[PDB]
Design a binder for this molecule. Structure first.
Ligand SMILES: *[C@@H]1O[C@H](CO)[C@@H](O[C@@H]2O[C@H](CO)[C@@H](O)[C@H](O)[C@H]2NC(C)=O)[C@H](O)[C@H]1NC(C)=O
Ligand SMILES: *[C@@H]1O[C@H](CO)[C@@H](O[C@@H]2O[C@H](CO)[C@@H](O)[C@H](O)[C@H]2NC(C)=O)[C@H](O)[C@H]1NC(C)=O
Ligand SMILES: *[C@@H]1O[C@H](CO)[C@@H](O[C@@H]2O[C@H](CO)[C@@H](O)[C@H](O)[C@H]2NC(C)=O)[C@H](O)[C@H]1NC(C)=O
Ligand SMILES: *[C@@H]1O[C@H](CO)[C@@H](O)[C@H](O)[C@H]1NC(C)=O
Lengths: 57, 50
């Protein structure tokens, strides 16, 4: 939504463009569009959905 | 200078005009071809038009 994806080598994070602040990738930090096939250089990682552990209680 | 991939710099340029950056990635080959062709037209324009 704002910022850019980065990896420390082992894990994937989203970060604001002008200061390194690594945050977990979530359905709040990110928006969907279309599917994997169209994007040049897309990568595979989990996106954590913050609602699911709440409803898992 | 901080390096950034050019297809990712252009996504920042698209957000800078209020076009959501998925519009670049979904059209990256088209946007690249329109840019390459437009630089083509500059050479033809300048080469002919004194
Ligand atoms: C990349 O970031 C992750 C998360 O900050 C690091 O994984 C953690 O590493 C510490 C030890 O350094 C462990 O105590 C945590 O349990 C780890 N968390 C997870 C979710 O695995 C990871 O080590 C970092 N990698 C690099 C190369 O810096
Ligand atoms: C991202 O993950 C998907 C699976 O979730 C990978 O898709 C598989 O790719 C291989 C090789 O083309 C196929 O044999 C499988 O049948 C594919 N599975 C599915 C469900 O499509 C994909 O290759 C991964 N992409 C990257 C860039 O790592
Ligand atoms: C958006 O506009 C471009 C033209 O700039 C369209 O791309 C052309 O599509 C036709 C076939 O429909 C081709 O003959 C041209 O060679 C294409 N031009 C380029 C530069 O690739 C594009 O199809 C349009 N898209 C939509 C959804 O209207
Ligand atoms: C990045 O660099 C090399 C040379 O262009 C190429 O082999 C590799 O596939 C490229 N990856 C992407 C995602 O374009």
């Amino acid at each position: 939504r704002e910022g850019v994806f980065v990896s420390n080598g082992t894990h994937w994070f989203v970060t604001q463009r002008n200061f390194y602040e690594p945050q977990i990738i979530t359905t709040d930090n990110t928006f969907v569009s279309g599917n994997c096939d169209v994007v040049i250089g897309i990568v595979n990682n989990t996106v954590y959905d913050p609602l699911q552990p709440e409803l898992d209680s | 200078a901080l390096q950034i991939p050019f297809a990712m710099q252009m996504a920042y340029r698209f957000n800078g005009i209020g076009v959501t950056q998925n519009v670049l990635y979904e059209n990256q080959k088209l946007i690249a071809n329109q840019f390459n062709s437009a630089i083509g037209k500059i050479q033809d324009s300048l080469s002919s038009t004194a």
